[PDB]
Amino acid sequence: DPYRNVPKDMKTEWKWGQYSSDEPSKAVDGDDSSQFHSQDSAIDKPFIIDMQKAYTIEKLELLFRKNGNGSVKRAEIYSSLDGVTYEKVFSNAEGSDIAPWATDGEVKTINFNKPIKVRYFKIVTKESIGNFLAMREFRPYK
Ligand SMILES: [Ca+2]
Ligand SMILES: [Mg+2]
């Protein structure tokens, strides 16, 4: 299956509430239709995914809401082994050389130039429709 190398039983950490039933766990439930949707502005707030174990990750796929509140245009992504010290591994924030994402609901892929040993990912929304984060799926690949 195409997702054989996506870690199972990822856990999430979000401290600022959800909209309706769109809970943080729905960003990593393997269902492209279900989503996390923040209750309020997610700008500069960390959405953390704990893979439970360190893996050498080769790429990320992110899937956001299509054309509505929470569709992400720009974000920074950080990685950590210990959950304290994070290093930036991706940015399409203003000033970077990477274009903002279209709000088209299609998979956004980040292919790492070399695999990175990581346990935790932190996603920091920098620009999004309505300032929310609405993330249908986050998939790191071993
Ligand atoms: Ca989902
Ligand atoms: Mg690997």
Numbering used by the authors: 954 to 1095
Task: Give the exact sentences the study uses for this entry.
In addition to the N-terminal glycoside hydrolase family 31 catalytic module, CpGH31 comprises two fibronectin-type III modules, three CBM32s, a putative cohesin module, and a bacterial immunoglobulin-like 2 module. Though the putative CBMs, referred to as CBM32-1, CBM32-2, CBM32-3, themselves are not closely related at the amino acid sequence level, a primary structure comparison indicates that they all belong to CBM family 32, an observation that is supported by their overall similar structures as determined by X-ray crystallography. Each CpGH31 CBM32 structure comprised the β-sandwich topology characteristic of this CBM family with a short α-helix and a calcium ion capping one side of each module.
Multi-dimensional heteronuclear NMR experiments were used to map the GalNAc binding site on the apo-CBM32-1 structure, determined to 1.35 Å resolution, as co-crystallization and soaking attempts of CpGH31 CBM32-1 with galacto-configured sugars were unsuccessful. When mapped onto the apo-CBM32-1 structure, the four regions formed a contiguous site localized to variable loops located at the apex of the CBM, comprising an aromatic residue (Tyr972) and several polar residues (Gln971, Asp975, Ser973, His990, Gln992, Asp993, and Asn1022), consistent with previously identified CBM32 carbohydrate-bindings sites. These observations suggest that the C1 edge of GalNAc is solvent-exposed and thus accessible for extension of a glycan chain at this position, while the remainder of the sugar would interact with CBM32-1 via hydrophobic and hydrogen bonding contacts. As the crystal structure of CBM32-1 lacks a sugar ligand, the exact role of each of these aromatic residues in coordinating GalNAc is uncertain.
